[PDB]
Symmetry: C4
């Protein structure tokens, strides 16, 4: 399960790296803003402080969302049940 | 399952075509902006860069959301488990 | 199941009526804008075109979200599997 | 199950307290605005009326989202099935 977590962890990093590079390059975001914009889109928070201004960006976002949401939510799920939950349980009993 | 994927794939295309046409016509969006606005609504990202200004648009969006979220999420789900996951598994072993 | 659908359908109407009345009264929205703002919040689209400006509104929204998301998503779910899906299946075969 | 509800209830309070304190301090929000901004992010509504302006804030939000969504959604789930649902059922029959 650490190896189930690790495949979804890596893939998520590679996916945010993807949006980071595209949005930095094409839409002109500082690298730090691209990553934050990539994370705010794929988790569907969607603040709207950054948003794609070019047609090339609007199209990329359509696909990135569909391809990206499934992964991201899956990592989060793996993260919560397989890492957060056990550590919570372990805190309720002392060693 | 390719045929389960294909029914949710088609239906999703027909649903985004619906919002594209309505928002282009009534709310005056360029076709490309309507589709992007339709995709950003039904996945609940909700940037807010485009938003309906007319009462006819505000009402349409209420129903489109309820009718549309169930489908869109279902396609994404089908897409992730039945297409993304296997291709991931196949990459871990060489032919 | 029509009666499972009908309890979640009613409850959802009562919940949107709640936000409609509160946001119209306290935050000064036209009734039509309140309902649309209520629907855009509880499905977590969150355009941000309308947003609560008063402290009384910011607090109400905190609770309305927590109390409201569970219902709304549940109706949508019931709506998709128990109404949309069968009608889709029925279209694939002619009477 | 009251004790399953109570662990997710507490943890959620502690998590919103976290964002409240960080966003008040670093991003300069009034305490009431931080909490509302924290609740609007972790449920992925994302109005965008408040949004982090500093790099320290953009980074914190990236992690807070990933760590926070799993909990918050889990509480909401527990809240809906284990508290809202029974009270609904109890209203359909008189004592
Ligand atoms: K949003
Ligand atoms: K927004
Ligand atoms: K879900
Ligand atoms: K959103
Ligand atoms: K959302």
């Amino acid at each position: 399960k650490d190896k189930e977590f690790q495949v979804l962890f890596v893939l998520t990093i590679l996916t945010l790296i993807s949006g980071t590079i595209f949005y930095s390059t094409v839409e002109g975001l500082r690298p730090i803003d691209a990553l934050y914009f990539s994370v705010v889109t794929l988790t569907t928070v969607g603040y709207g402080d950054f948003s794609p201004q070019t047609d090339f960006g609007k199209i990329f976002t359509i696909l990135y969302i569909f391809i990206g949401i499934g992964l991201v939510f899956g990592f989060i799920h793996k993260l919560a049940v397989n890492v957060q939950l056990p550590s919570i349980l372990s805190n309720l009993v002392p060693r």
